[PDB]
Design a protein around this ligand. Sequence first.
Ligand SMILES: COC(=O)c1nc(-c2ccc3c(n2)C(=O)C(N)=C(OC)C3=O)c(N)c(-c2cccc(OC)c2O)c1C
Length: 316
Amino acid sequence: SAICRATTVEVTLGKGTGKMWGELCRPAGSSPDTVVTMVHGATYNHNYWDFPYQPDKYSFRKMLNGAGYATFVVDRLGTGNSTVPPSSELNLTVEARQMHEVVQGLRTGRIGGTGFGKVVLAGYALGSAVTSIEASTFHDVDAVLITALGHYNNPAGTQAIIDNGLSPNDDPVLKDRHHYDDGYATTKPGSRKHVFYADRPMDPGVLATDELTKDANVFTEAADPLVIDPAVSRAIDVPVMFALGDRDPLMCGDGYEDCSSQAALRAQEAPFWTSAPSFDVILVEDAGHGLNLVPNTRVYQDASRDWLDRVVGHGL
Ligand SMILES: COC(=O)c1nc(-c2ccc3c(n2)C(=O)C(N)=C(OC)C3=O)c(N)c(-c2cccc(OC)c2O)c1C
């Protein structure tokens, strides 16, 4: 009981133009004023935000639709059903302009027909960096949901990704789709378990589904200084939820992102969100880096939902 229409969006790409794939979903028998736009992270695609194994439990999109909200999960360019351009043409700032265009199109009704009054941007990992830049540059979103991306980080976590990297032309899952140039990457088979999820308890079906729905990415975007720039996040003048897993191998550690308690995390990040009228923080126990895909994810889902209800509402 949820209406879902897949569509493509004409999006800026140097000269112009390229195709961004996205799915718009509305709760059955309902027409909400609020849409939540969901930008996935690196090496993932839209499936992260609409996960297809036990969706009742792990699909964040679905949870949102059940809460009354409209949702727009996208395939970032380079991934899934979207255009896969030359890696040189793509970077975070370019990608944020693309997201601005998706927002723009959801507000006016170009995307979806009805046209939404409130737009929420939701971000996972480097999608949160895309989200932040969009929010900072254009100021055309009513609230921002930041996940799996902190201002401090762990070099060794990042290095493990580099030590488990390979080219998507050598990867059995991604071989057949495209001929990717030398600036696209993905992760090795069997590596995600450790490099993202930290070896924490997971459903075996979740790990298998993750490796079967994984994607490529443009790996220069990870080294971008904009990912951790304080100037970007400090400029955000709307309500922000900041979500992080307490065993995230890319952030957490002594002398890095303080994942010892929620209050400590809150303390350490607050100097980076000073224009936000409200700054809320959830810290997900025994969780790695993919928050939607952990066994106690529902704690994270309920909090996110309750926040939305509090800072935007789903309209009428
Ligand atoms: C799913 O998580 C990510 O989007 C992600 N991927 C990665 C990631 C993913 C794939 C790759 C790489 N990094 C990478 O560095 C590299 N050389 C590759 O080539 C093999 C990758 O495929 C990240 N490094 C980072 C990252 C983490 C902390 C701080 C950062 O910058 C200040 C980050 O960019 C993130 C957040």
